[PDB]
Amino acid sequence: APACMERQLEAARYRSDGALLLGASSLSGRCWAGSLWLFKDPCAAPNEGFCSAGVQTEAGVADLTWVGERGILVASDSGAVELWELDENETLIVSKFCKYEHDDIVSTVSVLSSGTQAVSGSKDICIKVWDLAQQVVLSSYRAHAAQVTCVAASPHKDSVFLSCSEDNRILLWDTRCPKPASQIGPGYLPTSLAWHPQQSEVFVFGDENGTVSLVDTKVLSSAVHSQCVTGLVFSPHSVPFLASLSEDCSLAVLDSSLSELFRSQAHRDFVRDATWSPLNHSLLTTVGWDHQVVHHVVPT
Amino acid sequence: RVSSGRDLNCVPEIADTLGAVAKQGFDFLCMPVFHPRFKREFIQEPAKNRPGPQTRSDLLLSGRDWNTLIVGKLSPWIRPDSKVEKIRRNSEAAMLQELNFGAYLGLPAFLLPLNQEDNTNLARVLTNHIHTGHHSSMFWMRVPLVAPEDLRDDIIENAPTTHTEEYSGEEKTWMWWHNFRTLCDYSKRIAVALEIGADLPSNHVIDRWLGEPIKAAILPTSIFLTNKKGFPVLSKMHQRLIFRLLKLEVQFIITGTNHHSEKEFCSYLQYLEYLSQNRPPPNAYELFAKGYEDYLQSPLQPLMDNLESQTYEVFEKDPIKYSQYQQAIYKCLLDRVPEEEKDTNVQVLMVLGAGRGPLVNASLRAAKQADRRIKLYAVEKNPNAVVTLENWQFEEWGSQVTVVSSDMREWVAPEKADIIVSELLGSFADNELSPECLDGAQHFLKDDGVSIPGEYTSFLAPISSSKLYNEVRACREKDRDPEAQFEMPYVVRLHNFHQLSAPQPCFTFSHPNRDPMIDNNRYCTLEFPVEVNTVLHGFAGYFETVLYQDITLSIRPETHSPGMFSWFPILFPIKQPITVREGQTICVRFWRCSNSKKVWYEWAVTAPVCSAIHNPTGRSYTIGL
Numbered sequence: 001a002p003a004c005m006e007r008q009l010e011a012a013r014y015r016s017d018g019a020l021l022l023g024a025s026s027l028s029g030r031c032w033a034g035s036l037w038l039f040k041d042p043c044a045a046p047n048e049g050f051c052s053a054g055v056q057t058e059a060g061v062a063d064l065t066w067v068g069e070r071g072i073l074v075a076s077d078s079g080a081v082e083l084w085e086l087d088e089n090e091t092l093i094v095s096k097f098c099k100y101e102h103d104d105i106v107s108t109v110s111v112l113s114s115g116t117q118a119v120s121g122s123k124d125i126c127i128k129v130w131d132l133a134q135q136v137v138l139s140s141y142r143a144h145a146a147q148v149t150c151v152a153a154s155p156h157k158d159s160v161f162l163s164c165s166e167d168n169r170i171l172l173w174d175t176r177c178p179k180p181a182s183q184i185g186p187g188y189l190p191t192s193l194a195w196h197p198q199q200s201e202v203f204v205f206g207d208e209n210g211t212v213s214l215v216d217t218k219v220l221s222s223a224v225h226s227q228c229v230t231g232l233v234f235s236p237h238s239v240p241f242l243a244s245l246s247e248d249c250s251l252a253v254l255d256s257s258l259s260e261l262f263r264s265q266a267h268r269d270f271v272r273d274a275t276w277s278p279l280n281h282s283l284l285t286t287v288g289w290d291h292q293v294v295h296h297v298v299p300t
Numbered sequence: 301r302v303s304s305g306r307d308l309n310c311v312p313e314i315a316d317t318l319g320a321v322a323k324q325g326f327d328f329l330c331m332p333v334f335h336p337r338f339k340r341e342f343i344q345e346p347a348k349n350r351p352g353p354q355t356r357s358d359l360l361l362s363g364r365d366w367n368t369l370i371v372g373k374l375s376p377w378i379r380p381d382s383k384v385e386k387i388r389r390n391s392e393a394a395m396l397q398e399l400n401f402g403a404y405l406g407l408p409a410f411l412l413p414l415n416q417e418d419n420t421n422l423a424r425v426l427t428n429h430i431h432t433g434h435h436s437s438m439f440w441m442r443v444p445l446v447a448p449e450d451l452r453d454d455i456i457e458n459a460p461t462t463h464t465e466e467y468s469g470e471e472k473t474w475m476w477w478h479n480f481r482t483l484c485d486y487s488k489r490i491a492v493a494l495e496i497g498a499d500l501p502s503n504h505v506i507d508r509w510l511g512e513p514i515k516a517a518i519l520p521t522s523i524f525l526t527n528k529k530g531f532p533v534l535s536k537m538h539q540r541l542i543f544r545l546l547k548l549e550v551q552f553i554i555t556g557t558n559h560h561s562e563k564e565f566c567s568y569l570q571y572l573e574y575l576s577q578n579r580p581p582p583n584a585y586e587l588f589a590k591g592y593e594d595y596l597q598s599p600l601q602p603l604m605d606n607l608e609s610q611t612y613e614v615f616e617k618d619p620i621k622y623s624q625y626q627q628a629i630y631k632c633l634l635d636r637v638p639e640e641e642k643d644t645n646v647q648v649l650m651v652l653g654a655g656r657g658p659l660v661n662a663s664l665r666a667a668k669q670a671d672r673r674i675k676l677y678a679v680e681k682n683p684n685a686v687v688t689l690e691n692w693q694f695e696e697w698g699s700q701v702t703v704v705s706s707d708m709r710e711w712v713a714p715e716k717a718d719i720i721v722s723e724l725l726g727s728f729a730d731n732e733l734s735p736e737c738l739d740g741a742q743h744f745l746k747d748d749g750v751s752i753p754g755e756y757t758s759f760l761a762p763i764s765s766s767k768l769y770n771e772v773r774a775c776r777e778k779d780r781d782p783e784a785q786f787e788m789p790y791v792v793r794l795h796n797f798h799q800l801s802a803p804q805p806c807f808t809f810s811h812p813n814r815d816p817m818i819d820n821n822r823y824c825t826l827e828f829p830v831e832v833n834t835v836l837h838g839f840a841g842y843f844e845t846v847l848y849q850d851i852t853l854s855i856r857p858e859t860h861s862p863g864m865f866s867w868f869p870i871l872f873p874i875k876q877p878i879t880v881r882e883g884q885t886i887c888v889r890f891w892r893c894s895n896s897k898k899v900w901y902e903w904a905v906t907a908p909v910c911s912a913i914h915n916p917t918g919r920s921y922t923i924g925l
């Protein structure tokens with residue numbers, strides 16, 4: 001593994017067996033690169049010496065996500081989507097493909113229902129649908145007129161996904177239609193997207209002003225944060241809670257009515273990713289640019 | 301060679317990156333000075349107190365490299381015209397921070413985007429930066445031909461792309477530049493980095509960027525078409541635009557990843573180099589003019605001032621001017637003295653303003669090929685040129701040529717002339733006072749005598765050039781009217797400009813002038829149909845002359861004498877530039893005015909709006925008699 005990992009923690013993701021995936025970037029100093037880490041013991045993180053796996057990437061991690069249990073999909077500053085895989089021992093992390101298809105930073109990435117395809121968003125304004133087996137772009141969509149901020153794949157639909165951009169458009173997609181995008185609604189720019197895991201025709205979006213909104217595809221909103229809503233993640237419950245991130249350096253946890261249950265100003269810098277543990281549903285792990293891996297006990 | 305740069309938004313190691321970029325053959329690197337995903341806070345704790353460093357050390361490159369090889373880029377999260385006040389206040393602080401770090405490193409340029417209509421606060425912060433310190437960095441405003449909203453794929457069901465034509469709407473990104481440029485008060489330090497899209501717009505949209513200070517052209521890798529052998533090339537429409545940009549001597553910027561993955565990255569740059577070879581080479585004129593593009597000069601006054609040795613030398617080297625003068629005298633001699641009267645009749649030729657005698661030699665060369673006997677007078681006012689004439693008269697010409705050291709308006713002629721020959725013309729024809737000089741010389745021409753030239757006519761055309769307007773504006777001297785520079789003409793090789801309407805004739809003079817009342821004062825109203833949206837910055841002047849019958853000289857672009865470089869165009873600027881919409885008429889009014897001591901031009905615009913009257917009573921500009 002690398003000797004030391006980079007200060008700016010961008011991504012945090014739990015898989016089935018409760019192993020923590022971490023993405024890191026160096027956003028300051030001599031070298032502007034990034035790294036991927038696996039932590040079978042989550043309490044050990046972010047300590048580099050006491051980790052299961054660790055690898056260096058060419059450039060920074062803007063976003064990542066799991067591909068099943070073994071693979072890791074990565075949005076690079078290089079303008080590349082990168083697929084890494086763990087070995088059978090899960091000791092090393094090896095590059096499977098690194099394809100340079102975007103003309104600017106790849107900002108957002110999400111795995112579709114099948115798990116054989118994924119969708120990526122970039123500052124080059126385009127959105128690309130990938131075949132993870134063939135290692136190619138099936139479709140290149142230039143729907144937006146500004147930076148693609150967030151792309152979220154539908155939980156139980158391989159053809160459907162949300163996107164949002166600084167052109168102030170939230171697009172519902174369906175690749176089955178000959179015009180696959182559809183504009184939903186706005187006002188303040190949309191900055192984060194999350195599908196409701198149970199209710200197929202429901203999602204939530206956070207704006208740049210710190211407002212989290214609930215939307216039925218066929219509107220309820222709360223002023224949660226004092227700055228841009230960076231991320232929205234639903235809990236693994238049958239009646240799921242909504243974790244909300246922001247550049248105001250705080251975490252919130254919200255009910256069905258977007259009412260405040262928990263609050264944490266434990267981070268001293270930007271909160272970047274949240275991830276609920278499948279082992280203990282009440283436990284919630286956050287990462288930020290302060291280089292903290294904070295584990296929260298949510299009063300459920 | 302072509303000066304070219306690489307645009308990157310990912311630089312992991314500045315040292316390795318620059319080495320690679322240099323090896324590929326790029327002259328400079330466009331890169332971020334702070335990591336573009338590294339958003340910073342300046343007000344709200346705790347993010348305010350983020351421990352440093354905030355970016356890379358200045359020690360990673362040599363001073364020379366920063367000054368020559370690096371172009372800064374504004375982090376794209378910096379939104380000074382955001383509707384959110386918190387993002388507004390931070391983007392201000394970040395913009396100053398990044399710009400001040402640009403100045404610290406001593407970067408030769410810095411890139412800022414125009415990607416929306418309202419950039420009022422972006423302009424305010426930059427303008428404030430320009431007035432803070434003694435820094436020297438250029439500012440490249442990154443603006444596309446076509447706004448991304450107007451080239452998005454038509455793939456949104458409930459928001460279709462507009463099919464119905466919008467002539468004004470297709471020029472939206474030029475108006476972005478114009479407003480920003482205007483707010484910053486036409487700063488010399490603010491230039492355009494024009495981004496070329498996959499689909500080009502209508503010619504009128506491309507013509508809109510004529511006369512604008514384009515320092516860079518940004519070419520995305522995506523716009524390049526593949527050939528059979530697998531290399532990147534461009535369409536013929538794109539090639540045609542690259543040829544236009546090469547004339548403006550802009551730097552080319554390659555942006556985006558290698559879409560031609562099979563081939564090396566050099567291939568893109570190699571194609572520009574290839575096109576730079578395959579342009580037509582410069583003609584005799586374009587070779588001579590090379591160096592003088594949009595260079596403002598005082599129009600010569602050889603009557604008031606004595607011209608230098610090297611000034612006469614420059615003007616003698618024009619081969620076409622004198623071959624035409626020779627041909628004109630040749631044709632006049634044969635018309636005046638027939639074959640039977642050859643050896644009986646000796647024609648009295650008079651070179652009026654002879655300089656160092658190139659028209660004297662032309663007059664002698666004409667007489668031999670015509671085979672008619674001539675007596676020559678070489679009248680010159682400048683006694684330093686008269687030195688050159690008399691040394692020629694002793695060594696070569698002899699008693700055939702009589703060198704006179706006199707003003708032609710004063711000289712008491714011993715005998716009257718058959719032909720008077722003169723080259724008293726300026727870039728606006730009458731602006732060196734050929735009319736006044738020949739009027740005073742007229743009395744010692746015979747009743748049936750010829751003048752060469754016999755006739756000349758000036759032409760005016762309106763122009764858009766924010767480049768030349770700014771260039772004129774910077775000619776303000778101490779201890780004179782602070783707008784006097786706008787109330788005088790300049791002789792200039794007009795290069796970065798747009799001719800808004802066809803040239804029309806202004807003032808005409810005939811020699812000899814057999815008018816009972818001789819008045820060289822003039823008044824002329826011109827109406828110029830304009831087919832484009834534009835901004836008027838002044839009027840380009842040209843002329844034509846009849847030497848004799850069919851034998852002519854001209855610097856009218858549409859009738860220009862091939863290879864003749866003795867006259868560049870003249871420019872009449874205006875104090876305040878005038879917006880002109882498509883369909884509108886530019887109405888200009890020109891006066892030629894005089895007393896016994898001075899001659900000058902007054903001019904005004906009357907449509908589509910009024911200018912002030914320029915140079916009233918010759919307060920800023922006169923031509924000395």
Ligand SMILES: Nc1ccc2cc(CCO)c(CC[C@H]3C[C@@H](n4ccc5cncnc54)[C@H](O)[C@@H]3O)cc2n1
Nearest residue numbers: 602603615653655680681682707708723725726866
């Ligand atoms: N835009 C230009 C460009 C090139 C020119 C070249 C020449 C001479 C190339 O051989 C001249 C004539 C300059 C001559 C005239 C003479 N002059 C003017 C009033 C006058 C009264 N009486 C007698 N001589 C008088 C003046 O002294 C100079 O020698 C003008 C040009 N204009």
